[PDB]
Design a protein around this ligand. Structure first.
Ligand SMILES: [Cl-]
Ligand SMILES: [Cl-]
Ligand SMILES: [Cl-]
Lengths: 72, 149, 72, 149
């Protein structure tokens, strides 16, 4: 039983490389980038304009995930 | 990779543990890329009392491409044509990898309670809808009884 | 004992309004905002240039916190 | 505003839980806005075998303003004047609210081990240090014995 907020809004799976967009949404780099490069340059959730360079590595979450991975 | 399969398996999980109201869905064979979903005509709509069947085909590069969703049962509706094609922006230009079949399903339902004639697919029904809206329900409930009951 | 990644780099207290910087570092809006005003326009940790308008809401983290504020 | 006090308290709770190597700190009576700290000679420095006392005074903007840290124990060092004033980056231009007293204490130990003669508070020692290294160690040793032993 994996919480949702630890899964990618695209992959639906746990996040390996979490990173947040300016709209304040976290994706898994590999998936969010596949989207920006094949679908369009917008936030899959807010649809605001978005581009690879605008992705900040959500370090906090990255830890939070490691934590969860320990006890599981 | 075959992330599509992993994504589809997860979606199915969610969809089946909490299915859109009035709806139901599941893979056909062990083909998680070929689903069949069914919808109960909503409770005010002249579609009320009918059972509608649709086919959902997930493209190999899902969820980056939208799913192919079509009505296999006949329906008198302005946004759904004779060969089960549904006119719902979200299934076309407005598709987003973040959306899910469950969401699409919900739209189709609400789209059954509130047709959008300003963006037709079947002009006549769209017209009959705009003007003689009473004649619309007459033929809608008629088709439901003849093709969905 | 609260996990660390769920606390402010400044406040050290649990995070009420977690927002991220382009450095991946997450602070509590209140604290980091005063720092930018009283201390300077740089990331408290990385020290790279930073302005208040660059702070992004770390929503994922906002719900990871609530999630913790659950069992406790 | 009183967040300062809350923060200072966590630091103290933290500090006394896992003291920086060679160091020790704790409140000086009441208001945690005032601390006492002792540092054992850097073993590795000519200050070895010496015990030094410092006073930490937290401003009201803490942690937005660096703590006021000073030696009370006399010490022969180019970066510390006879008033126990310490020329530390991390106490001046390089301060950050992300830094801690603990860190400051390690930084000070580091400084004992390796003085920074180019940014002195005592030109004269800075000189001896850079020119006659030995004379420097001798006096430091002598002063440690006389004032910190
Ligand atoms: Cl994702
Ligand atoms: Cl987020
Ligand atoms: Cl903070």
């Amino acid at each position: 039983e994996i919480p949702d907020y630890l899964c990618g809004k695209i992959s639906f799976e746990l996040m390996a490389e979490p990173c947040i967009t300016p709209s304040g949404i976290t994706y898994d780099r590999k998936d969010i980038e596949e989207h920006l490069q094949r679908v369009g340059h917008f936030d899959p959730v807010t649809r605001s304009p978005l581009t690879q360079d605008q992705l900040i590595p959500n370090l906090a979450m990255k830890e939070v995930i490691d934590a969860f991975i320990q006890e599981n | 990779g075959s992330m599509a399969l992993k994504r589809i398996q997860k979606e199915l999980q969610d969809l089946q543990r909490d299915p859109p109201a009035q709806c139901s869905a599941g893979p056909v064979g062990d083909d998680l890329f070929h689903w069949q979903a069914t919808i109960m005509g909503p409770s005010d709509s002249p579609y009320q009392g009918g059972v509608f069947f649709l086919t959902i085909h997930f493209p190999t590069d899902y969820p980056f491409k939208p799913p192919k969703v079509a009505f296999t049962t006949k329906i008198y509706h302005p946004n759904i044509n004779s060969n089960g094609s549904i006119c719902l922006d979200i299934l076309r230009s407005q598709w987003s990898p973040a959306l899910t079949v469950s969401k699409v399903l919900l739209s189709i339902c609400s789209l059954l309670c509130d047709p959008n004639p300003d963006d037709p697919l079947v002009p006549d029904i769209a017209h009959i809808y705009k003007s003689d809206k009473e004649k619309y329900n007459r033929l809608a409930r008629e088709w439901t009884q003849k093709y969905a009951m």
